[PDB]
Write a structure and sequence with these properties.
The structure is cut from a larger assembly and holds 14 protein chains of twelve kinds. With 49 residues, chain D is mainly α. In chain D, 37% of the residues lie in helices and 0% in strands. The relative contact order of chain D is 0.22. With 52 residues, chain F is an all-alpha fold. Chain F is flat. The radius of gyration of chain J is 13 Å and the shape is globular. Chain L contains seven helices and no strands. The longest helix of chain L has 35 residues. Chain L is elongated. The chains are: A mainly alpha (110), B mainly alpha (77), C alpha+beta (50), D mainly alpha (49), E mainly alpha (95), F mainly alpha (52), H mainly alpha (221), I mainly alpha (130), J mainly alpha (105), K mainly alpha (102), L mainly alpha (172), N mainly alpha (128). The interface between G and H is large, with 84 and 72 residues. Bound molecules: cardiolipin, heme-A, 1,2-diacyl-SN-glycero-3-phosphocholine (PC1) (2 copies), copper (II) ion (CU) (3 copies) and magnesium ion. The site of magnesium ion has 2 residues of chain G, from loops. The PDB classes it as electron transport. The entry lists the keywords cytochrome c oxidase, electron transport, mitochondrial carrier, membrane complex. The entry is titled "Cryo-EM structure of Tetrahymena thermophila mitochondrial complex IV, composite dimer model". Chain A is Transmembrane protein, putative.
């Protein structure tokens, strides 16, 4: 398990660090985005919200839902992609939200 | 928030200040702010009804308000 | 999930510099405008920018 | 010593604190619906940490 | 299951008697902890509900109080304007 | 390095034809070729074929 | 080094602005968009002027509380003429009343001998956590804290918020900051730094945006 | 309903003076505790928006910066920096609103180039380098064609404003000062980076390095 | 994890809003937001009387302001009188404004009397116990 | 997909698959494309629902980034490419529109 | 059989990730047009667009005004969050020359 | 473990001496150096140092109990494997001493996962001690009582240290 | 103190046994987690007792 | 310009001072620098006129191209020729002895732009 974790780390964190070391004439931002994406975005993040009921009560879940929708507002964020949606009701019981997509503001859950 | 409780002050000087502001606002707004210089501060109006219940009750009473208006007119000549 | 990876989406920025034995907090000029442009929840969860 | 005290003392303490001391509330507060809750005891004092 | 397999799985050592006697006592020592944890969870939920209400309806009530005070001023202003009209009729006999 | 005429945004019929073409091309991928869905996928697949 | 050569042809960058779908920032008087620029060096010996510092900050220096010698009365001038001199004290009913006591004597008696007890709250017993300035921030919103250090590593440690940001020299570390309640939190330095490692306190006040805006317009905007 | 229903009558003053308010009693519901709750409203306001204190010597409202309980209680006699209370809003209206995050701003140099690192030092250098290129283009035209003009008739926003603000955001003032020293050293000599750059001759080829760069991109609705 | 907390208090509901005229206030505020008026003073239903200059010239302050200089459009918003479009789309919100003002006046007319024996235990009726 | 409707991209269906195929795997525009798939669920087939979905995309772009009133109405080319990143409201709008186009049913 | 089940689960994850388009295309063809239309109708949400005031008051004038198909709002909903691109003089001139429909 | 880790600490302190007295700017950010490298080198030495401090005491308890209980230890091979696994995994957990210095989140996740997984080799030791304490001929001795005190202290210390790898708690 | 709004958050007494304050979400989560962490030992604890 | 308030006066002073950086630094000259005869004002105006004439030709083509890549490619293709000519001009002006030599070099550069530069630009634009 430890060796698999270390190999996974070196695959996407160590070696890709050496791909770009000089300013690039063509699509420099594209290449830097590629290097960063294969490292910054990890799978676990999605679970971190896909099972948010394991520690978030209903009301805390509602508050953290609005907080997460605010904090992941920026569109240019590959980590926000591959992250389970905050437009969801609490599995146990939902108080604030009556329907998933019935809002008065697009970027606010109410 | 942990807001503590404190009742209306009814302080003499504070209520005199708030009542002077209220009289200025009444005189200004009774003519749709046609004065040369308007000194009314609307926000303090709110505080007049939060910390001077006795004077607010006097102003609501028609006879008390009539007396206040007569005295203010005498003062303004 | 709540205290990390949200630098891009912040209302405004404060700089904390730790000189020896006292702190320095810097508000940049742009912050001023960032505080003027703030949506407000008015009515039934409707947001307005003035 | 091993079982009864280490598994009931803190619960008894919290129950007595809420029952008698009102969980140590600073009572001079205005609106319960707008005030933070003084939580009952939650850090166990009968565990080493 | 398999008694022989489960009686020497733990490093060929036998603690099955103490394991068997552990369930009966362990079935009751967790009740005070569980009930007080229920109390604590309810307190946490109530606090989170209060946080949501103060975040949402906190600002709204202050505006309602502001409008109440402005409406009191409006009533006083209507009466004051009626008095001003009367004084406009009675130029100086009112005083 | 000239440029070509940009057609107007497609109507619903053209969008439906595009969706049909995309799904038909999706159906053609062999299950033993593990290429993820991405812009370069088809290109990669072509490359892979030639490489093989 | 070398020289500023007599002529330089400079390519105007394209696409730096997308405000109204225009990729040509510059246009000459004839109305034709410009792709190139000519820069000339008229004077070959003069120095080149230093870049003017555009950056302007509101800087709050939070240091430990300094002991008072005398309680100076509140004095307001018309200039150089005392318009109003007073000795205000904040009463228990939230009024700045006129004090009939000697404020210096009260200060010195609190300094000398103040009543204390075993179970005394941290609110009423502040000896190492006192500063002369407060960092005021809004609540229920996102603040990017850029942490850095002038000389050595310090640790901005807020126990009430349960956070600690390591201020490291040469590292402009960006942290997200969200406070979900109205709260006045004290804090300390949690990285060994020298003489006054213990006496390096922090005070952060998270307030609702109306009160934060009042503080910002009254104490922040005037710089 | 008349065809002009909803049209504001000419000379409408929005005035409610001398109006019968007994016709609206069926358009709202007040619960039995409305009298109690009203008081609570006032109470909360009187103790929540009252961050200022009336002064008898000045006979006016004053205030001070946020202070701890120990200083407010045991140093109430020794108060410093008292400023006359100016009001929450200039016009006296209400300001008690719930806030949120305003829309983001366009990015010229993305943060996602170096986003795995919480410390923005390579990103700071990259953004400052891009701004310095833009400045080297426009630095001497600023006082004649841009923000620093004498008259507002010829006022134009400096083309490097966004890159400058991004670089300022990514860098602390110390590192920004270091980079400004470097920028001065390179602008005194007029050192464009293209005068020295040759590393593209020792870089591996990429699909983005094709001679026909405009035709490499496939556009699709 | 799955059942680490061993219990979740779903019984405690959201705090019920029992404010006197909150519904009318929110309705009026939504209606005013529909009008899309730059002036914020219109949020209060009493604006025609508190700030009558909004209907004549818009001068609400006697040059005692700090909103910076009139360099952009988003300046001196309260120093801008209501236009014909703003006045029309505010008149469309007249009935809700009147209902809000009537609710406020009725609430003001409510006085604490000696027959309110349940004043000291009004929290229970206010539904503060969950 | 914190801003979208589904916990995982597989619940989005064919529309999310087409959005993935539209952009490179490191491009965050896909998420915006996904939002298009959310806006045109019951609207694509309705002749005015399509216009409503495009208006929803315009509002979404205006809310994510600061925008000017005419800015999204004067876009010369609404086509997208693989390396189009949501750095501007125009790019957000284009990605959202492309997602709307790919929403069958 | 434990190894076989683990291998099958791993292959299922790999196929789900890598053949998303093919799987979704196959799933879209398992139901007829009517079923998919019903499902799409059930999942139709406004998402916060054009969430203007909905008059609940019975005597509200805006209730009848909104029932009118020819009613024009002062500004389009997507334009309520866009910065103005014209001068204040132009804005005031346009608003003062504005005339109400009907 | 000491043979592996000693040169790293020696190099770090020699670099510190050169930086102090020759102005080599090894740990000065202004012209190339980085202060974080010093923490990396020192803690790469340091966590194995605490492990080499603690393991021989594990050896001490494993001899007294079999001596006084008149029976074989529960499983000596598993205890040896547990200490060897702790030694091998002590080289990949030093970063838990540097959570807040601004490490990349991948590094923090790696360090936290490997540090939390230390609890499994350490639980093997406790289970083996408990199983070695049963079903035997017990002779109560002062070394035995000291071993029991060690057992209690180690239990508390190990649990508390395991809590410290919970990153959110570790920040506070 | 900010007016009658007591912005103070700690109120931590001497001989304090737990967290300084529970007015922040992180510390509330940690407190609940610690309590329930101590809940899940019963059987194991009981087992050792008998041993 | 005299009548204004304090803020307007300060802003005017700031705008004036931001333009006198060339005035303040002209006194601080270096002895060891390699001086050259600068390009005269009339030659500067002629060179700028030639550049504007070039911009006249390219304007419809670049404003009718909807791709930034094509416009950047057009800019790069012309810039290489212009940079070669600029290098020739810089060498021949730095190595100039009198104003006659500097005028000769500037005239040669302007004539190159007006004779071959326009032809090269036209060929490029026809290609696009
Ligand atoms: C006659 C016998 C009748 C038996 C009927 C069946 C039992 C029903 C119980 C239901 C309880 C329940 O659901 O509670 C949920 C209830 C959930 O509360 P909530 O939902 O937050 O809202 C509170 C309510 O609004 C308001 O709640 P409240 O403030 O009114 O709290 C009262 C509640 C509080 O609940 C309890 O006290 C529950 C019982 C505690 C444990 C009982 C002994 C178990 C010993 C096991 C071994 C330990 C080692 O007590 C009861 O309801 C008890 C009713 C029956 C009393 C007689 C029981 C005798 C036999 C006990 C066996 O739990 C609590 O309130 C917890 C408070 C107590 C925490 C623990 C206190 C100490 C416990 C240990 C006592 C000493 C034992 C060791 C002795 C030696 C020490 C050295
Ligand atoms: C030799 C001494 C020693 C030992 C053995 C350990 C062992 C462990 N340590 Fe410790 N540690 C130090 C000495 C030691 N440590 C020192 C000196 C520092 C200071 C460094 C500095 O200044 O920063 C430090 C710092 C330190 C930190 C960083 C704290 C901070 O950054 O300042 C962390 C967590 O990241 C940590 C964790 C651990 C863990 C998980 C173990 C694990 O190996 C523990 C393994 C034990 C178990 C996990 C099994 C427990 C047994 C049970 C069956 C549990 C059940 C029992 C009950 C519930 C009571 N240690
Ligand atoms: C991780 C493991 C932790 C524990 C490991 C072991 C080490 C610690 C061992 C502790 C041993 C007990 C010490 C305390 C003893 C007193 C208990 C106490 O005060 O608890 C506080 C608790 C709590 O008291 P409290 O209600 O004041 O709570 C504190 C309240 N606050 C915090 C708000 C101030 O009190 C009780 O539990 C009282 C009820 C129990 C009383 C039991 C008396 C009878 C004892 C019988 C002994 C056995 C039978 C003998 C028969 C003889 C026949 C001849
Ligand atoms: C492992 C250690 C197990 C034994 C712990 C003994 C108690 C330690 C302690 O001081 O606990 C604080 C607790 C006090 O709890 P507390 O500090 O939470 O009190 C809450 C009330 N206020 C905050 C107002 C003070 O001490 C006790 O409850 C003592 C009980 C008797 C212990 C007798 C031991 C012999
Ligand atoms: Cu320090
Ligand atoms: Cu320190
Ligand atoms: Cu360690
Ligand atoms: Mg440290």
């Amino acid at each position: 398990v430890c060796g698999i974790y270390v190999i996974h780390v070196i695959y996407n964190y160590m070696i890709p660090y050496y791909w770009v070391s000089t300013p690039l004439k063509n699509d420099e931002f594209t290449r830097l985005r590629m290097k960063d994406y294969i490292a910054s975005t990890v799978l676990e993040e999605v679970y971190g919200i896909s099972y948010a009921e394991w520690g978030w009560l209903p009301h805390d879940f509602a508050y953290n839902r609005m907080r997460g929708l605010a904090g992941y507002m920026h569109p240019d964020d590959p980590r926000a992609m591959c992250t389970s949606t905050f437009h969801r009701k609490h599995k146990y019981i939902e108080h604030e939200v009556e329907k998933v997509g019935d809002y008065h503001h697009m970027t606010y859950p109410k | 928030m942990e807001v503590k409780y404190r009742g209306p002050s009814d302080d003499k000087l504070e209520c005199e200040f708030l009542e002077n502001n209220l009289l200025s606002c009444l005189r200004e707004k009774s003519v749709q702010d046609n004065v040369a210089k308007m000194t009314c501060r609307p926000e303090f109006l709110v505080w007049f009804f939060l910390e001077c219940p006795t004077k607010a009750a006097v102003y609501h009473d028609p006879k008390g308000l009539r007396n206040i208006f007569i005295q203010d007119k005498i003062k303004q000549k | 999930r709540l205290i990390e990876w949200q630098n891009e989406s912040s209302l405004f920025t404060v700089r904390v510099r730790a000189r020896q034995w006292y702190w320095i907090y810097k508000f940049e000029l742009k912050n001023f405008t960032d505080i003027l442009s703030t949506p407000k929840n008015i009515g039934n969860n409707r947001w307005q920018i003035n | 010593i091993v079982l009864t005290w280490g598994w009931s003392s803190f619960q008894i303490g919290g129950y007595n604190y809420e029952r008698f001391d009102d969980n140590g509330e600073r009572r001079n507060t205005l609106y319960w619906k707008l005030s933070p809750v003084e939580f009952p005891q939650s850090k166990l004092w009968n565990r080493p940490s | 299951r398999n008694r022989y397999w489960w009686y020497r799985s733990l490093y060929d050592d036998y603690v099955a008697r103490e394991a068997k006697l552990a369930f009966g006592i362990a079935a009751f020592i967790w009740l005070p902890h569980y009930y007080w944890g229920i109390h604590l969870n309810r307190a946490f939920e109530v606090n989170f509900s209060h946080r949501n209400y103060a975040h949402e309806w906190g600002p709204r009530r202050n505006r309602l109080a502001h409008s109440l005070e402005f409406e009191q001023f409006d009533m006083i202003l209507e009466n004051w304007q009626d008095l001003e009209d009367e004084y406009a009729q009675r130029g100086d006999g009112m005083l | 390095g000239f440029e070509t005429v940009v057609p107007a945004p497609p109507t619903r019929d053209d969008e439906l034809r595009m969706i049909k073409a995309t799904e038909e091309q999706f159906l053609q991928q062999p299950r033993y070729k593990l290429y993820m869905n991405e812009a370069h996928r088809i290109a990669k697949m072509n490359h892979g074929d030639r490489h093989n | 080094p070398g020289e500023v050569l007599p002529l330089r042809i400079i390519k105007y960058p394209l696409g730096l602005e997308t405000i109204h779908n225009n990729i040509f920032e510059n246009t000459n008087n004839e109305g034709n968009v410009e792709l190139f620029r000519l820069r000339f060096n008229s004077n070959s010996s003069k120095m080149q002027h230093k870049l003017v510092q555009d950056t302007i900050y509101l800087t709050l220096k939070q240091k430990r509380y300094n002991r008072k010698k005398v309680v100076a009365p509140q004095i307001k001038y018309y200039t150089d003429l005392v318009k109003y001199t007073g000795k205000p004290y904040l009463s228990n009913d939230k009024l700045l009343k006129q004090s009939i006591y000697d404020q210096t004597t009260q200060y010195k008696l609190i300094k000398k001998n103040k009543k204390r007890g075993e179970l005394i709250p941290v609110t009423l017993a502040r000896r190492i956590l006192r500063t002369k300035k407060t960092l005021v921030l809004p609540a229920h919103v996102n603040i990017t804290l850029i942490t850095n250090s002038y000389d050595i590593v310090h640790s901005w440690f807020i126990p009430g918020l349960g956070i600690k940001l390591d201020c490291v020299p040469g590292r402009s570390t960006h942290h997200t900051f969200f406070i979900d309640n109205v709260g006045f939190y004290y804090g300390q330095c949690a990285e060994i730094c020298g003489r006054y490692h213990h006496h390096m306190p922090i005070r952060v006040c998270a307030l609702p945006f109306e009160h934060f805006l009042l503080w910002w317009n009254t104490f922040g905007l005037p710089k | 309903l008349p065809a002009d229903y909803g049209k504001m009558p000419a000379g409408y003053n929005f005035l409610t003076r001398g109006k019968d308010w007994r016709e609206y009693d069926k358009d709202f519901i007040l619960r039995t505790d409305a009298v109690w709750e009203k008081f609570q409203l006032e109470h909360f306001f009187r103790n929540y928006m009252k961050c200022f204190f009336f002064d008898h010597g000045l006979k006016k409202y004053q205030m001070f910066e946020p202070e701890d309980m120990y200083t407010v209680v045991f140093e109430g006699w020794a108060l410093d920096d008292l400023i006359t209370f100016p009001g929450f809003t200039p016009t006296g209206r209400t300001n008690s609103y719930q806030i949120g995050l305003s829309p983001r701003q366009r990015t010229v140099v993305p943060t996602q180039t170096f986003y795995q690192m919480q410390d923005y030092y390579m990103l700071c250098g990259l953004r400052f380098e891009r701004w310095f290129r833009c400045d080297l283009v426009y630095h001497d035209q600023r006082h004649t064609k841009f923000d620093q003009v004498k008259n507002q008739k010829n006022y134009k926003t400096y083309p490097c404003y966004r890159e400058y603000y991004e670089a300022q955001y990514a860098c602390q003032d110390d590192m920004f000062d270091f980079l400004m020293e470097l920028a001065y050293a390179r602008r005194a000599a007029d050192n464009f980076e293209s005068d020295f750059a040759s590393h593209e001759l020792t870089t591996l080829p990429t699909f983005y390095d094709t001679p026909k760069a405009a035709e490499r991109k496939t556009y699709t609705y | 994890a799955l059942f680490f907390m061993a219990n979740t208090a779903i019984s405690v509901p959201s705090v019920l809003d029992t404010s006197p005229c909150m519904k009318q206030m929110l309705a009026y505020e939504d209606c005013v937001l529909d009008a899309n008026v730059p002036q914020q003073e219109v949020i209060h239903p009493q604006w025609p009387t508190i700030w009558p200059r909004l209907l004549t010239d818009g001068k609400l302050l006697e040059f005692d302001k700090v909103p910076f200089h009139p360099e952009n459009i988003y300046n001196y918003t309260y120093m801008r009188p209501l236009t014909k479009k703003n006045k029309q789309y505010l008149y469309e919100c007249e009935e809700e404004r009147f209902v809000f003002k009537a609710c406020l006046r009725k609430v003001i007319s409510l006085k604490k009397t000696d027959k309110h024996t349940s004043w000291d235990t009004a929290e229970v009726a206010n539904l503060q116990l969950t | 997909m914190a801003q979208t409707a589904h916990q995982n991209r597989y619940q989005g269906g064919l529309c999310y698959a087409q959005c993935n195929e539209l952009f490179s795997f490191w491009n965050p525009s896909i998420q915006q494309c996904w939002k298009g798939c959310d806006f045109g669920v019951g609207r694509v087939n309705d002749p005015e629902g399509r216009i409503e979905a495009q208006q929803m995309c315009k509002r979404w772009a205006a809310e994510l980034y600061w925008t000017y009133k005419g800015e999204l109405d004067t876009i010369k080319d609404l086509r997208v490419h693989a390396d189009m990143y949501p750095t501007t409201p125009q790019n957000v709008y284009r990605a959202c529109l492309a997602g709307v186009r790919r929403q069958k049913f | 059989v434990y190894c076989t089940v683990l291998a099958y689960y791993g292959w299922w994850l790999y196929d789900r990730y890598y053949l998303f388009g093919k799987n979704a295309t196959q799933d879209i063809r398992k139901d007829t047009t009517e079923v998919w239309e019903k499902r799409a109708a059930l999942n139709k949400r406004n998402w916060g667009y054009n969430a203007h005031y909905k008059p609940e008051l019975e005597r509200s004038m805006k209730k009848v005004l909104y029932a009118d198909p020819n009613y024009k709002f002062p500004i389009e909903w997507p334009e309520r969050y866009m910065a103005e691109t014209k001068t204040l003089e132009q804005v005031m001139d346009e608003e003062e020359n504005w005339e109400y429909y009907k | 473990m000491l043979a592996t880790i000693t040169p790293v600490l020696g190099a770090a302190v020699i670099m510190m001496a050169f930086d102090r007295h020759w102005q080599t700017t090894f740990f000065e950010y202004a012209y190339g150096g980085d202060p974080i490298l010093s923490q990396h080198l020192f803690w790469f030495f340091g966590h194995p140092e605490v492990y080499v401090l603690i393991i021989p005491t594990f050896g001490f308890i494993n001899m007294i109990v079999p001596h006084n209980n008149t029976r074989r230890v529960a499983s000596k091979h598993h205890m040896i494997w547990a200490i060897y696994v702790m030694a091998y995994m002590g080289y990949l957990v030093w970063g838990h001493h540097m959570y807040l210095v601004g490490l990349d989140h991948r590094s923090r996740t790696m360090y936290s996962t490997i540090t939390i997984m230390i609890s499994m080799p350490a639980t093997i030791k406790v289970v083996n001690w408990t199983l070695s304490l049963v079903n035997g001929a017990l002779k109560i001795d002062l070394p035995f009582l000291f071993s029991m005190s060690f057992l209690l202290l180690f239990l508390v210390a190990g649990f508390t240290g395991m809590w410290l790898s919970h990153v959110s708690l570790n920040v506070s | 103190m900010w007016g009658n709004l007591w912005t103070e958050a700690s109120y931590q007494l001497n001989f304090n046994i737990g967290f300084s304050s529970l007015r922040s979400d992180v510390l509330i989560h940690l407190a609940q987690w610690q309590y329930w962490w101590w809940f899940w030992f019963a059987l194991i604890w009981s087992f050792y007792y008998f041993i | 310009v005299e009548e204004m308030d304090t803020i307007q006066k300060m802003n005017y002073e700031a705008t004036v001072n931001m333009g006198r950086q060339d005035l303040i630094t002209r006194e601080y000259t270096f002895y060891s620098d390699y001086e050259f005869i600068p390009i005269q004002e009339d030659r500067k105006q002629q060179m700028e006129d030639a550049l504007n004439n070039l911009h006249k030709i390219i304007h419809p083509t670049v404003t009718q191209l909807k791709k930034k890549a094509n416009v950047q490619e057009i800019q790069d293709r012309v810039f290489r020729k212009l940079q070669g000519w600029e290098g020739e001009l810089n060498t021949c002006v730095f190595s100039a002895k009198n104003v006659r030599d500097s005028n000769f070099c500037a005239d040669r550069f302007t004539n190159r732009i007006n004779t071959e530069g326009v032809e090269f630009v036209k060929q490029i634009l026809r290609e696009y």
